[PDB]
């Protein structure tokens, strides 16, 4: 009778502010919190998935020795289930984003992708999301959009987020009007995280037209403090993070490279004080 | 070129303020919005499912004649699929909460209920929610809780809210500590709407202790002037609406009783000016 | 001794008058009534699914912003699940018609569409109908019908209506004899809603030849006084509503435009007395 | 061109007037229409399923010999799948209603019934409806209603009507208050046809309180001049037909009895005028 | 090339050290890493599912106010789906252990539990594990074990860990020989996490005899200095962590108390360098 139900204190719902994800089930919003830091709304994603069509890329020839010491320093790991089960220790304890597409290679057509793992297996490995390429304007574009749909159709049954990454190929003009077309279609079809390329004009425009968080692709490795201005620019006009690739594992200062990348995204750091985490390491 | 992405304007998630329902999928939140008014957060639910174990209850002998003109002034209709399909015209265009429990009758033990319709048919009939009686303290309580468990498990797959109605047994009172026990376990098991009966002391402690909306059922017929004080009291110390059966259709002016409960719930009306326009019609 | 079954007054079924929808289950008839007002039998549909193959179309760069305040003034909203969950709040409380086709784009063949979301997810989102493009006379005409067939097969299990939208090419003469070919087949295939374009000669024959309701596609952006004339005569020749977009959200006065569209549709307003209080607020 | 769409003539829906069945899918409305003649809205059903718990009951020892010549003068046959496949020839071309309950007998508890055939097989047998006993007030009242629930849930997936037969005990009074309770519970649960017994006072009130068609069970053999008054009284009080087992096949002039029953049910003839067409044969 | 395959340096599998979990799939091993900290192999679990059969016990009347600020201090949360979706924010970003048993209450038999959630929904809710009570020696012991058997069966398909919690009666004077029975059977049946009570004589034989990790349940409220002696004694004698419900939300220093529990489990902190992790507030 002296117990306190606090009748004086009205119940009020606590808002979920991750962009365009305010009308999702708890679990899907839960997995998204593992990727996107709840304080920050952004992520630093470590991609080491390129072997799914490229093979032993420079720096991913040995995942266990040169990429293993880098896991602890990533917000979220991105790889394949083959790489995950083989060389990525479960005890590493980081959110994982699975490559669920493949059946392409650098010797044949690049857009000829199919779903590379079932949602059944994405769940069994306790994934936070699945990722697939969308290839608008390429030969097998129809199929590429269909891969997303199947993952999204499957993803809703289980609360598993889908990442659509807009994949450019051969000779294709990277501009804002294309990626605006490309990112939006993926988001329009239902993808909840978008991975894209930074564009020097109108990146502000691809993010705005995209209702859901947007992440940056690294591109080819530049000298180790390079376009952290790219990251800084990306974060400054709305990118929700970076899914950096070779730009990290091929850096010759891999643990010290991302301590730099953290700062630009979460620490709202100037691009040129990213070098203040220096390569004198 | 002439496009306006309003880059000056960051995208913002709009909070869903309905109590304990801020982390549900769009469709489930959508279904809750037909029932729970999105700007007042409350409901006036018309229950006439009483015949599912009582037969032709008084006021309910002819649903097509005496209840048909009331569909139109109700927020939500509550009946069985048998009544819904037979005499409730689809063109009524009101949210329906289906009675999904039964296999008991006033001739036997009354807590002896089982699921009376599959989620398949609730979806087929475009239900906004499914409802079942839970009988805490009764001979057959275990099964009644099991019914909700099944309905919630089935309901989550499809975005269908589940309503639990606290059916009291064998005069075991019917005080606050009992309804706190009944409502919370039900809410704990996963039901997003809870129907309970009003008590004259401490109804505020039942509402506060329940993580999801609580609406009260009308009970046996009272003088309409004694019955809107119940509504006024329930809503004022936190009820998120009403599920009023017999205090509507047993009255001499159900349509005028209608508006009066409506006046109390949504319009924050004091008790007797709601009947000061009960007799105005 | 106190019951009144009013045996003198026989039960009489109340007819469902919606054209060609008199032999449907309650739930399917229920869903059609959120869309078609049961008193007028008509609809005003706000289409903002344009981005599903076009990207950030002019007027849809910010759905979150410029088209969102217009939701309240539409009878039914039409969009994608990607857009719906991201930027359309559940509290909007409007019937939704989901874009259920896609995998095409402005860079490739435009008739090459596949089903873009499962019936599983349409239910989960509490859709009122699903829509797909049919491309009669086009390269992927066959597949476009197959998608329709597939949607009807899934919809019938669950009581969900399918809307067929006529897909035009850069090749095709738009006349009465053609839309009669396009609309009839879709209706013949099982579609309960057909979306087509107005023709200035013989539109009365397109309406007559279709056993189910016909709604108008918006067509190219017009001066608003041209689009209410488009609206008035089609409804004058039997149309059951509009599936309008750019004549509303590209208008520089979107809210004032739909009230003008409601009046022409519903209130049998002549187009130039509809313009009366087009300039209200 | 010379086509006649006769656009001056709007399409108008033709109502399905069968009581409480105006909101059913076409196929379900189709099956109910084979049973209930749409011109009279009534039926004469020849029930010979008695062997499912009674064994070779009197008059039914030889279905192939003393019941076979009666099929043609019946509107719909009611039997079990065992009798149907074995001794009822397919070429009979009459509607059949399958007994879908059993597993009881005259040597044990008579309410102890379970579902006796899957919906898979009712369809396989081109059934127009499935039937089960409901045993209100009995030991297995719970089970008997659950049997109905399972059949109605299954029937809705397939457009198969379910008939509920008020299985009554007994030490228990056959008054209107009982059949009103039994019939209402069954109809409320979803059964589209209810078979019950005629009572000399307030049967019209059993009819009025049931939203869906009511057909009467024949009961034990009466003098045929007495059974035509039961028929006359029942139809006069709102009943939609007959479910006549023993008052037909136990008569020594069964064919002439069904014509006598036909006259009362469809052609609205008096009992004493239907009686001299009971003779004449 | 620019390749470095380190042929001199063979790949080596990283051993997974969690007790009895060296033969599990990555995903299952992954989920256990969110619960048992990879540094220590230990956990501090915050249980507040008590209401699933007790209703609003003291400290749990309002989860959102007095339990919400504690999310910050446990390794893993243990609760129900009803509490989770309603009052636990996804942005909490915490490992969750769902209550997967219920259908009991304090007014009836307490061992009368059933499986309370589909594995489907635990996955949808991104659980790290599901938990159920085992009631060895009680009247409904059989079902409680089957509940465990079923959850593991569902879990093994999906890589979802099952926790078995030992449910005691006041039949039993509870000692070491008995909890040895309860813990072992469950682990034997397949549960990978075990919850037990401390016994002051022979707790060493329960942990050694249990092949999979054991966490101790707090039990009823005791003074914090000896309750931290419970934590120290259990952890020091091989227990792998705590599943601490009532002994935290008992304190007038709940928030400052778990740091005392925190330190003892993770750092092998002395019980009474721990009584005063009060300080200044
Ligand atoms: C198939 C791909 O697109 C990968 O190459 C990838 O996305 C990794 O990131 P980056 O290193 O390309 O930026
Ligand atoms: C147990 C019941 O009676 C339910 O049918 C119910 O909750 C309807 O409410 P009311 O009729 O008591 O107002
Ligand atoms: C496939 C489409 O393009 C439809 O979205 C459509 O045509 C209706 O909107 P409007 O663009 O005609 O106004
Ligand atoms: C199994 C039955 O009892 C029903 O098939 C039935 O009611 C037959 O009619 P009657 O034998 O009562 O005339
Ligand atoms: C039977 C219970 O009460 C469980 O819920 C439990 O043991 C949780 O921890 P504590 O209450 O022992 O601290």
From Swiss-Prot, chains A, B, C, D, E:
Q: Kindly summarize what the UniProt induction comment says about this protein's expression.
A: In the absence of AI-2, repressed by LsrR. Induced by AI-2, via release of the LsrR repressor. In the absence of glucose, induced by cAMP-CRP by direct binding to the upstream region of the lsr promoter.
Q: Where is the active site?
A: 195
Task: List keywords of the entry alphabetically.
Answer: Cytoplasm, Schiff base, Transferase
Q: Name one GO cellular component term.
A: cytoplasm
| Annotated signal sequence range | none
Under the heading Pfam families, the entry gives:
DeoC (PF01791)
Q: Which residues form a coiled coil?
A: none
**Subunit structure as annotated in this protein's UniProt entry:** Homodecamer.
Q: What is the annotated role of this protein in its UniProt record?
A: Involved in the degradation of phospho-AI-2, thereby terminating induction of the lsr operon and closing the AI-2 signaling cycle. Catalyzes the transfer of an acetyl moiety from 3-hydroxy-5-phosphonooxypentane-2,4-dione to CoA to form glycerone phosphate and acetyl-CoA.
Name recorded for this polypeptide: 3-hydroxy-5-phosphonooxypentane-2,4-dione thiolase
Query: Organism source for this protein?
Result: Escherichia coli (strain K12)
